[PDB]
Amino acid sequence: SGFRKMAFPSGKVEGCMVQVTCGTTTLNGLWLDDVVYCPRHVICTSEDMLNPNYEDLLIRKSNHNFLVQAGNVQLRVIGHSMQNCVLKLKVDTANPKTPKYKFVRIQPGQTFSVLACYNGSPSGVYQCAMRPNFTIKGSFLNGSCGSVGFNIDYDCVSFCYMHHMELPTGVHVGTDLEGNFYGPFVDRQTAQAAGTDTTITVNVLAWLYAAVINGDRWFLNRFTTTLNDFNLVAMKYNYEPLTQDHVDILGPLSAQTGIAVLDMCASLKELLQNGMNGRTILGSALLEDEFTPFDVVRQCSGVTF
Amino acid sequence: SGFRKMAFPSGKVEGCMVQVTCGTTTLNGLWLDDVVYCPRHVICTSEDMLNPNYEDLLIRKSNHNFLVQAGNVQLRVIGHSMQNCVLKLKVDTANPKTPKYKFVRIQPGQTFSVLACYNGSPSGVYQCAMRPNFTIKGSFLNGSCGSVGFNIDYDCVSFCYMHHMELPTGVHVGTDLEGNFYGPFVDRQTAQAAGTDTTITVNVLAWLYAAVINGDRWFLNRFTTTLNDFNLVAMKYNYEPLTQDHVDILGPLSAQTGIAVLDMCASLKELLQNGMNGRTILGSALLEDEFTPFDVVRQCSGVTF
Ligand SMILES: Cn1cc(-c2cc(-c3cc(Cl)c(F)c(OCc4ccccc4Cl)c3)c(=O)n(-c3cccnc3)c2)c(=O)[nH]c1=O
Ligand SMILES: Cn1cc(-c2cc(-c3cc(Cl)c(F)c(OCc4ccccc4Cl)c3)c(=O)n(-c3cccnc3)c2)c(=O)[nH]c1=O
Ligand SMILES: [Cl-]
Ligand SMILES: [Cl-]
């Protein structure tokens, strides 16, 4: 028992982290096979970041201007190209520590682990979620650019996130590993505000099922509801609408606990309407939405990697 | 910016995890140099666990009764001994993946990362704290025994915890790597209740400093207090007493924010006396006590390993 915000074991990603230096800039890269991936703004000076023309800036860079260090091992760069907002540096050595891997673009609401790094060196690991406004609420300081987010399934690392910028509000934005930003953000120091940060309803429901499995039952009431009625309430409290697809993804948790999904929605509706009256659920005084249904089953069943 | 419950990168410990099997039992072991460490209750049957005499049970076990598997690599056990509540299996091969390491016994209030494992395979990593009653609030299922807790300083792993049992209340108890239980617990299936779970005051103060550094300032008031007066309030709310030593450990956070420690105590006193009025601090609706002063500085400064 117990329920914790749990990250995947990070070792398979630690072995891929390198330092990339261009001119005066140093940030993190991801070394997989014979390619190193990093944010393309590694080629910018402070003044370039205000209105960079990346193709023009790249004209003035050659393979030997990119320095890649892994430990003290210095890697030899034999080619470079820009793919959307990431740079791909071809090196002459395949990373011997490369895990089975793939690149995936995740949907809002999905969670992943972040390995925060500085100077190619891992600092810590934590869990977060793609917010509905395509930001993440991470923990990142200067020098953290190029840190990656990932999921692990058995022995396969699914890289889904590369860190690029912190917005003036303190939330974090980045790309998939094909270099396409999540959401409407662009890698320029220019005004960019995030949209509404709504709550991920299916994840809250999954966490309420985790609570029940763990013995926190006080919020279970004896009401039910309908999808349309619940969604009227979701809208009022800036919750994402619940769909039939979401109901189906919660099926396994419903089967394990015997609590119909719409019954749990009725309990959530009462919690939204009356608050928690100084009580707690799984040690939290608010409703948590960064556990997916799959997170809850994995943690509550013991799945390993 | 941002502030997250952050675990150390786990890779250095992943490379040490093995499966230990005795008879019908299988749990996790820690392979460092040519020794494997695991809970001594690996030799018990279900009936033995009610009142085991471990020395007597060990009389009937030989090296070849202990099976140690690392991947599919089967290790050859060339000796065994019991040290307090752990078994030490001497194997004929040094772990090539052994990190720099040491064994430490931590004090209540200190935090560490847990690598939860099942069948010698890592499942996830999360942060927790030695509670004042010498329990931890982990996330552990059957098969998790022998999972370890640790801190990492530069390149040195400091192992502080080995998981042994879940109490009927659902909290978790274990040993240091010398096999001595934290707190009064014993490895027998017999009535054992934990003491009061008080709140770690110095850690709450550290987290309030983290909040200030991150821009959550609403709880700062214009009062101060004294150590003795604050502690009167700490006692009423089942907080641990604050000492001068604690005040000194918070000095660096005080220096960075300009907020005298006793001023922050005054803000905490008002929070304890009036609650948070539906507000949040660093995304939490309660006061968090599983960040140490050192956790806050490391996370807010970018220290790597
Ligand atoms: C040279 N250099 C630079 C960085 C680096 C760059 C950035 C960064 C990069 C680009 Cl292209 C930007 F358009 C940018 O505008 C952010 C912004 C957007 C909209 C309105 C205002 C603003 Cl200000 C920021 C960054 O946000 N961070 C960072 C800091 C704190 C936490 N997370 C990320 C770090 C680095 O890590 N290493 C290194 O060597
Ligand atoms: C054969 N076997 C056994 C275990 C295993 C053993 C235990 C376990 C071991 C011993 Cl010596 C106990 F005295 C014990 O009494 C707990 C208790 C104390 C006081 C009052 C009532 C009770 Cl019930 C429990 C366990 O607590 N857990 C566990 C389960 C869930 C979460 N965390 C830990 C697991 C294992 O992991 N693998 C494996 O093969
Ligand atoms: Cl947690
Ligand atoms: Cl967190």
- Residue A230 CB–ligand 1 contact under 6 Å: no
Options 2.40.10.10, 3.40.50.360, 3.40.50.2300, 3.40.1190.20; which CATH number does B13-91 get?
2.40.10.10
Q: Which CATH superfamily is domain A201-301 in?
A: main proteinase (3clpro) structure, domain 3 (1.10.1840.10)
Domains B100-175 and B201-301 share a fold: no
* Contact residues, chain B, for A285 at CB < 8 Å: 284-286
Instruction: State the SS3 of B205-270.
Output: HHHHHHHHHHCCCCCCCCCCCCHHHHHHHHHHCCECCCCHHHHHHCHHHHHHHCCCHHHHHHHHHH
* Contact residues, chain B, for A116 at CB < 8 Å: 6
Of A2, A11, A304, nearest to B139 by CB-CB distance is A2
Query: Which atom of ligand 2 lies closest to the CA of B186?
Result: 13
Amino acid at B36: V
> Which residues neighbour B6 within 8 Å (Cβ) at sequence distance 6 or greater?
A116, A123, A124, A125, A126, A139, B127, B295, B299
Strands A156-166, A100-103: pairing is parallel
Mark yes or no for CB contact A302/B214 under 8 Å: no
Of A44, A117, A145, A160, which residue is the catalytic one?
A145
Gap from CA of A143 to ligand 1 centroid (Å):
9
CA distance A157 to A101: 4
CA distance A21 to B301: 21
Mapping DSSP to helix (H, G, I), strand (E, B) and coil, where does residue A18 land? strand
| Residue ranges covered by each domain of chain B | 13-91, 100-175, 201-301
CATH of domain A99-175: 2.40.10.10
CA distance A200 to A134: 12
Mark yes or no for CB contact B1/A116 under 8 Å: no
At which residue do the structure tokens 């006061």 appear?
B287
Of A2, A118, A285, nearest to B286 by CB-CB distance is A285
Q: Resolution of the experimental model in angstroms, please?
A: 1.6
Q: Any catalytic annotation for residue A44?
A: no
Amino acid at A190: T
Distance from the Cα of residue B63 to its chain's centroid: 31
Per residue in B90-129, is it b (16+ CB within 10 Å) or e — as a string?
ebeeebebbbebeebebebbbbbbbbbbbbbbbbbbbbbb
CA distance A171 to A164: 11
Residues 215-234 of B with CB under 8 A from A: 215
Cβ atoms B40, B83 nearer than 8 A: no
CA distance B93 to A275: 58
Half-sphere exposure at residue A42, Cβ-oriented, CA atoms within 13 angstroms: 32
> Which residues neighbour B20 within 8 Å (Cβ) at sequence distance 6 or greater?
B26, B27, B28, B29, B36, B38, B42, B66, B67, B68, B89, B120, B146
- Structure token digits, residue B256: 């960075």
Cβ atoms B102, B156 nearer than 8 A: yes
Q: Any catalytic annotation for residue A145?
A: yes
Q: What architecture does CATH give domain A15-91?
A: Beta Barrel (2.40)
Of B16, B41, B80, B164, which residue is the catalytic one?
B41
Chain A contact for B153, CB < 8 A? no
At which residue do the structure tokens 């673009």 appear?
A105
Atom 34 of ligand 2, residue of closest alpha carbon: B142
- Å between B197 CA and nearest CA of chain A: 13
End-to-end CA distance of chain A: 20
DSSP H helix total and E strand total for chain A: 8, 13
Chain B contact for A99, CB < 8 A? no
Of B4, B143, B172, nearest to A139 by CB-CB distance is B4
Chain B contact for A37, CB < 8 A? no
CA distance B104 to B161: 9
- Structure token digits, residue B237: 């709310």
Half-sphere exposure at residue A3, Cβ-oriented, CA atoms within 13 angstroms: 24
10 Å CB burial of residue A252 (0-12, 13-18, 19+) is: middle
Chain B contact for A139, CB < 8 A? yes
Q: Which of B38, B10, B265, B273 is nearest to B162 (CA)?
A: B38
CA distance A46 to A53: 13
Chain A contact for B211, CB < 8 A? no
End-to-end CA distance of chain B: 20
- The domain over range B100-175 is classified in CATH as 2.40.10.10: yes
DSSP, residue by residue, A168-235: TTS-EEEE-TTSPBSTT--SSSS--------B-HHHHHHHHHHHHHHT--TT--S----HHHHHHHHH
**Other C-beta atoms lying within 10 Å of the C-beta of residue A283:** 15
Cβ atoms A78, A90 nearer than 8 A: yes
